[PDB]
Amino acid sequence: SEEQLNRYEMYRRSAFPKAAIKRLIQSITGTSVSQNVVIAMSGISKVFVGEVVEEALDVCEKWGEMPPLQPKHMREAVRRLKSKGQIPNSKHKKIIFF
Amino acid sequence: RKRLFSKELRCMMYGFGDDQNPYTESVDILEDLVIEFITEMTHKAMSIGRQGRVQVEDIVFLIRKDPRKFARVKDLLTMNEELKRAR
């Protein structure tokens, strides 16, 4: 239609800027990264945003609300993703044997 | 901290079905989630492989388990190589 073609345009053309993530990663490493790191790390974070919004619209469709996304559907989105291990936290030393 | 992903993330939520005009608080939650994800991946990458260096190989091992993200990384790298060859 005429909205699906505009939505497909924003699904492809949108990206995080490489001039800021290279500034963001290098504040964590200390020295330097490469261009093929920033190209991949800018691409995984678009999949991760698409992992949340496609699942936060499943929270909103499950409850009785409309397309505008309140934060109620967004804290619930991170809760359901974390219970399936999708959201990694490297500060919680987990233990499976008890 | 200011918001470094305020205008970029509003295009992306529209790209996955949200609205043309999302809420500022929802955009803020998404920006915080993206920063936390990038930080976690960078620490694990520094630990795995070459200590103190984050490489594409380390990032690929870390994302190997999740199918959607692994496929995207492989496609982007292959397309980048192809574009360099075309140039």
């Binding site: 924003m10 949108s14 505008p68 | 970029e8 295009c11 529209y14 043309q20 005009n21 999302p22 500022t24």
Partner: peptide, 26 residues
């Protein structure tokens, strides 16, 4: 020179269509 000016035109239309009014929520 063609790659340098055309890169910012994919993002310039990404500030005219999406996000016209800024909302909030209780």
């Amino acid at each position: 020179v063609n790659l340098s000016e055309e890169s910012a035109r994919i993002l310039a239309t990404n500030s005219e269509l999406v996000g016209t009014l800024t909302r909030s929520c209780k």
